[PDB]
Design a protein around this ligand. Structure first.
Ligand SMILES: Nc1ncnc2c1ncn2[C@@H]1O[C@H](CO[P@@](=O)(OC(=O)CCCC[C@@H]2SC[C@@H]3N[C@@H](O)N[C@@H]32)OP(=O)(O)OP(=O)(O)O)[C@@H](O)[C@H]1O
Length: 209
């Protein structure tokens, strides 16, 4: 498998990895783990807060490492769904709320973030393990076990077509919830319908993230 670097603390594994690729100091595939993040990044430049114990890493892939039929807009959905299936095989009840959120019950415990740079895809995943502020993962699997499973699910190289069909079975759970559009405004998923490229339509309007 691919090299892993583990830091006790970084501002952000995503920022670290992106800047190393931009400077041509690393090459995909490579995996970057921070035991603690001090300036984690969510979606839309929101903060992803560090908990007492959290799983936070970023994984750089080459396009060739992903299905040929995977649209760029579906990156977070595809990698997020595989991560969730890794969690489910380890006994977790975690589910994927559209577009890229890891939920337990009806509370967010983690999220997926994909940045694209020169055809390389930088997948950043955070999941709370221990915290008094936020909900946490419902299993005890080591971080190494979760990440190894993740690398293997990616390695199975399933068509995007297959993965979305699995997710389409559970999209409906998202209908009770909402997401933030590009301008930060809450939008209900009640009437949202899934599209074959991972986007949704709500009464004739298409959304992505
Ligand atoms: N610890 C916490 N637990 C629960 N909730 C928390 C929280 N900290 C803040 N919150 C609240 O969660 C909202 C903001 O999260 P978010 O913008 O993005 C994401 O999930 C992407 C996460 C990817 C991080 C990984 S870590 C390893 C890489 N390096 C790093 O730098 N990036 C990646 O999603 P969102 O809330 O806007 O919801 P919708 O998708 O439904 O619109 C907001 O509420 C906030 O208070």
């Amino acid at each position: 498998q691919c090299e892993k670097r583990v830091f006790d603390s970084l501002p952000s594994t995503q920022t670290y990895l992106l800047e190393k690729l931009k400077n041509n100091e690393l090459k995909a595939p490579i995996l970057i783990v921070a035991k603690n993040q001090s300036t984690g990044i969510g979606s839309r430049g929101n903060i992803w807060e560090g908990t007492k114990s959290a799983l936070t890493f970023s994984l750089a892939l080459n396009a060739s490492d992903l299905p040929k039929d995977l649209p760029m807009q579906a990156n977070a959905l595809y990698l997020g769904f595989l991560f969730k299936e890794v969690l489910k095989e380890l006994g977790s009840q975690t589910w994927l709320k559209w577009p890229n959120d890891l939920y337990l019950g009806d509370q967010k415990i983690g999220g997926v973030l994909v940045n694209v740079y020169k055809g390389m895809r930088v997948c950043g995943i955070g999941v709370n393990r221990v915290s008094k502020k936020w909900a946490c993962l419902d299993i005890g699997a080591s971080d190494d076990l979760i990440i190894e499973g993740f690398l293997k699910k990616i390695e199975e190289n399933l068509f995007w077509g297959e993965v979305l069909s699995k997710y389409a079975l559970e999209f409906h759970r998202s209908n009770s919830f909402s997401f933030h559009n590009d301008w930060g405004e809450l939008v209900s998923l009640k009437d949202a319908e899934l599209l074959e490229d991972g986007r949704i339509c709500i009464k004739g309007k298409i959304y992505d993230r």
